[PDB]
């Protein structure tokens, strides 16, 4: 089956910039490729069909181009109503397949997280489990890595990281990992550390607490 | 005005059946082909099949040919999809779409989407939370936080200070664990209200009416 | 009912019946003008065919892109005016030379008996270009806009247009024959000129009416050699391409009933079992193939309508094949049971592809892809004439069927590849 592919999951853009999203078939579709845009929590709306036609009623800054196997949607002078997901459908043959999508994102400068470690709570401590949270907030680029070093032992198991979506006021991000140990596990060990290996600085931002405290 | 309205928000024990509906308004279901599409949580769109309402011919994606049955009723002007032998993998948003030819260039009109949840759990939330401040030298912003965990199956709206909060209120998207859920939310502002007269977290799980408050005391 | 008689769906059947009647009387007139000249039907008839086929093979895409980029009423009326003016202008020459025959007036190369044939063929070619433009626009555009969004009403309009073609292809030659044998074949040609002149104005009016009565038609959405490849790659980039080629292959056929009356039609007398019934039976299986389409299309759909209308044609042409071998007069019995009982699958397949091209082709490209399908249809009709000439010997016929049945089986593989790719590789 024809497997539409979109290399970039993310594109960092700015308002008034020309952004070109690329889509690549797995066989010769011809001009059988349409472009949908969906915003979070909505249904996909048309933009461009047969790889060049502009559906009736979409602004004139959306352009589409390509033929054969390699196609392109092109936003000229991007506005702030364009930050969305875009995907290419092929109707050359059944089963229909969609492109896996390409999420736009306004591009900021750079920043480093304000790591903040918080030791287990009393009521949770009596609840057969102790979860230690670290709250990396107001970060720069999306990606980051945490360090679950209990007694300087990187624990890859029992972690859970959840990142926000780019804030509409600062285009930053935030994240939060939580090592979920047992009430017998938090006891038999002594150290608890979290470190953030973000690109902002080669000196990792490591925060830690002491079970003695 | 052409619309497709869908039944919404089903929650189904695994191994059961479910039927999802898509009611057209402003056109004839019979002049079109009706397509079903699935969007998994953080995943790409997938095509399930179409039905020709005139003669009732259905075509499926070979990976749905076992456990998808698309039917239609022109008299009611409505199309249906039946999912059988449900599993954890089935949770997704199902869309009903409308195409004109066998090779129509596009899906002009789409359904609102129907979230389907396949799980075997149901409980209340456990709100445990505390600020930490010890051995510190100069306070950052006292950075208080909250942790709602083990929620049986609902969308919590933990908001702090009861609208007295600030833009300094980051709500981390929830995630599943042992078939329960877990969330978190952090606040960091006004380094003067740390230690002194401060605010509290209030989280309310509707499906269990767990509207509980918890004022975070110092270390 | 006075309520159906004024519908735009009927002022379209009427304006189409008139055009088809004019075209067909004029074709039979030009076919009896080719008897005041070389009496043979091989060299000069096939060259008339080669000329009209080449002209449309070249200009199909330019005509199509002219149908698109311009308008809907101006296109229909320009094409109507051009065809009827060229028809009266050919009929006048036909008469002014159908009287004064064999009078060489000058001795130079502009002499009469050949400048007459050249002029008749040029004007007939312009008439055919204009009538192809009218076919494109009216059928592929106004039937699809008038029929609205109704896949069972459009089926009926398509089958109705075809039934009108099929009964006119019989009744028009007989009417013009009674006129041309009643008094004389000069007043006949003058009469077809006058008929075409008045029906020009009648159809002008009928088109203007159908335009006022459906407001959805007023809504529109090296340049020559440029728009020749800007239409032949589009027609190739289409997902429906493989069906419009499987149809084009059913035109390179010698077993088409009209051509078998030319060669291998001897030893049978007229009005006993030839033009009274064998010409009237092939008009019955042409109506009996358009009523199977609208029926099958409801029961089993429009892609399996082409799959049964294909193993029907192929299975009746296994009669024209067992003929030329006669394994266990007879031979002419079967060859005509095949040519006639295989028009059920040919007129039912022509209608699925016509309807796949109608709802699966974008409105903006609706005239271009429909010109390039015409050119594809003649490119294979041309290679039909190239094969009857240089192979006209009676002995060399046993092979003009086997290589005319093989282009059938090869046009129903390019549809079985279309079907198996559209609805279930393993599901049928
Ligand atoms: Co004609
Ligand atoms: Co012939």
Author numbering:
A (entry chain C): 21 to 233
B (entry chain D): 20 to 238
C (entry chain A): 17 to 237, 289 to 395, 453 to 552
Paper text:
In mammals, ferroportin (Fpn) is highly expressed in enterocytes, hepatocytes, and macrophages to export iron ions that are absorbed from food or recovered from digestion of senescent red blood cells. Fpn belongs to the solute carrier family 40 (SLC40A1)10–12 and is a member of the major facilitator superfamily (MFS) of secondary transporters which includes glucose transporters (GLUT or SLC2A), peptide transporters (PEPT or SLC15A), and equilibrative nucleoside transporters (ENT or SLC29A). In this work, we expressed and purified Fpns from human and from Philippine tarsier (Tarcius syrichta or Carlito syrichta; TsFpn), which is 92% identical and 98% similar to human Fpn, and we demonstrated that Fpn is an electroneutral H+/Fe2+ antiporter. We also determined structures of TsFpn in the presence of Co2+ or hepcidin, and the structures define two metal ion binding sites as well as the hepcidin binding pocket.
We reconstituted the TsFpn-11F9 Fab complex into nanodiscs and prepared cryo-EM grids in the presence of 10 mM of Co2+. The images show recognizable particles of TsFpn-11F9 Fab complex and we obtained a final map at 3.0 Å overall resolution. The final structure model includes residues 17 to 237, 289–395 and 453–552. TsFpn adopts a canonical MFS fold. The 11F9 Fab binds to the intracellular side of TsFpn. Because 11F9 Fab bridges both domains when the transporter is in the outward-facing conformation, we speculate that the Fab reduces metal ion transport by stabilizing the outward-facing conformation of TsFpn. TsFpn structure has a large solvent-accessible central cavity between the N- and C-domains. Two strong non-protein densities stand out in the cavity and we assigned the two as Co2+ binding sites. The first site, S1, is in the N-domain and coordinated by Asp39 and His43 from TM1, and the second site, S2, is in the C-domain and coordinated by Cys326 from TM7b and His508 from TM11. The density at S1 has higher signal level (12.5σ) than that at S2 (9σ) and both densities have higher signal levels than those of the surrounding residues. Both S1 and S2 are solvent accessible from the extracellular side, and the distance between the two sites is 16.0 Å as measured between the two ions.
